[PDB]
Amino acid sequence: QLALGDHAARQLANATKTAPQLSTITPRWLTHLLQWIPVEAGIY
């Protein structure tokens, strides 16, 4: 070995961590396309 290795050197390094990925996410186009109306007391 001539110099310090990558495996040893990484111990001082901070990894970039992503938020967990969810496979089931879909664009959900219908909710975006529909028009939403507020109801005063849950009755229409």
Next chain:
Amino acid sequence: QLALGDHAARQLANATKTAPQLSTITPRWLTHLLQWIPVEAGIY
């Protein structure tokens, strides 16, 4: 010969020189299309 020739006259003239042309250059569309993310310390 009535007058000075083109071959002799060129010796006083400065040629327009291009930078060398490389045939292997390609547009490389994928690199342009991809989104690039920086990593803090080489770990993702």
Next chain:
Amino acid sequence: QLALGDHAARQLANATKTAPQLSTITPRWLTHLLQWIPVEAGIY
């Protein structure tokens, strides 16, 4: 060959070109030494 050669490298370089040299040019001392007189209409 370890690196680019001089013959190839010169193709991008601009040569310094002199005006043509004439061997028959002489100092012509007599013309400088003589005194020159203008004549009005070519008759003296």
